[PDB]
Every structure is written in structure tokens, then in C-alpha cells.
Homo-oligomer: A and B are copies of this chain.
Amino acid sequence: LVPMVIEQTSRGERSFDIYSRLLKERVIFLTGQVEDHMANLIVAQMLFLEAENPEKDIYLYINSPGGVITAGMSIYDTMQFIKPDVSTICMGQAASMGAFLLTAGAKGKRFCLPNSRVMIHQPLGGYQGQATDIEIHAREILKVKGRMNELMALHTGQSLEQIERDTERDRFLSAPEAVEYGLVDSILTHRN
């Protein structure tokens, strides 16, 4: 059950759900397996906040084990499109897609919690059918692999060759290791 909170305003007392109250403060929660429906919801929140104030910065809290690539690209493309800088904070973990979205945040505004765990791997897919169809889908996933690696190299700042080697197999990076790799910029240890 989602709890309800009261917000004091000039008009009077107002009741909001815990998630909507934080949305009012430009906070979007990315939680669980990435998919088309949850991604479209996040896209709607980014566009809504852009209109309210295109100057202020938006925040994205990523705690997810990854998911569909196509759904993630909808979020990634939306972040780069809108004028507001999107700050990404990793809570708990950030897998292949969560990590791609984490590093896709605005340069200097990417954060990670101290005990967080980041993991990056290459795309995984499968197709059953004729050899001709296999060649088509096989070429498509390879293109996505190259495209994802090219974008990660840009945000992380590492060379494309290095990304291919590291993403060939699952690689787990802690919060300090991620800072060196370039996935995140700083760690939020304590409130200052």
C-alpha cells in the first residue's frame, strides 16, 4: 500500500501519494524490470516536468536489474532531447540498461551511493526459425551492440575498444570503481 502525505500550500491542505509528492519536486523513480509500459510512464513525467520549468534539473533514481533495450532507448532519447539536465542516482544496483541510463545522465550530475553495485554486459537475445531469418536478426542485434558500446564510450569517456573488451562478459563495478571507469562522477556518502 502506497502511503498518502499532506502538503501545505497557499490554497490549503492537499493530499498526495508519496510518489506524486516527490514528482512535484522533479524526482522520477526508475524501479524494476525495464519495459514498454513503465518506460512510457517515465517519458510522460520527463515531458511534464520540462514544461513546468525547463531550467531546473530533473532527478532519476535508478534501482533496476535491466530489461528491454528498445524501452530504454525511449528514456535515453527523451533525456538528451529535453533541455533540463537529468541527474542520475544509483540506489541498490544498476544493471545493463540501468547502467546505460545512469551514465547517460548530465556530465557532472551523475551520482552513486557508496554500497551500490553496477553491472554492464552486452545485449542478449534469441530467435528461432529459418536460417535466412536468423541472419537478419543476428545482424540487427550486432548493430545494437555496436550502437550501445559507441554511446557508452561517449558518456564514460573510455575508448570504444576498451568497452568492447569489458562488456564481452558481465563486469561488476562498485561505486568507487565506477567513478574511475567514468560511469558516474561522484559518490553521495553523507548530507553536507
Each complex incorporates copies of this chain amounting to 10
Q: Which residues of B contact A192 (CB under 8 A)?
A: 83
Q: With A22-B44, A131-B125 as given contacts, are A115 and B73 in contact (CB-CB < 8 Å)?
A: yes
Q: Which residues of B contact A76 (CB under 8 A)?
A: 115
Binds B, one of A7-15, A155-163, A178-186: A7-15
Q: Which residues of B contact A41 (CB under 8 A)?
A: 2-3, 18
Q: Which residues of B contact A56 (CB under 8 A)?
A: none
Q: Which residues of B contact A132 (CB under 8 A)?
A: 122, 168-169
**Interchain nearest-CB distance for A131 vs B (Å):** 5
Contact B36 A32 (CB under 8 A): yes
A53 within 8 A of B: no
Contact B23 A3 (CB under 8 A): yes
Contact A81 B32 (CB under 8 A): no
Contact A44 B73 (CB under 8 A): no
Interface centre among A1, A18, A92, A127 (most CB of B within 10 A): A92
Interface centre among A5, A18, A137 (most CB of B within 10 A): A18
Q: Which residues of B contact A143 (CB under 8 A)?
A: 172, 174
**Interchain nearest-CB distance for A53 vs B (Å):** 13
Mask: chain A, 1-45; 1 = CB below 8 Å from B; 0 = not: 111111001011111111111111101010110001101110111
Q: Which residues of B contact A154 (CB under 8 A)?
A: none
Contact B44 A70 (CB under 8 A): no
Contact A20 B4 (CB under 8 A): yes
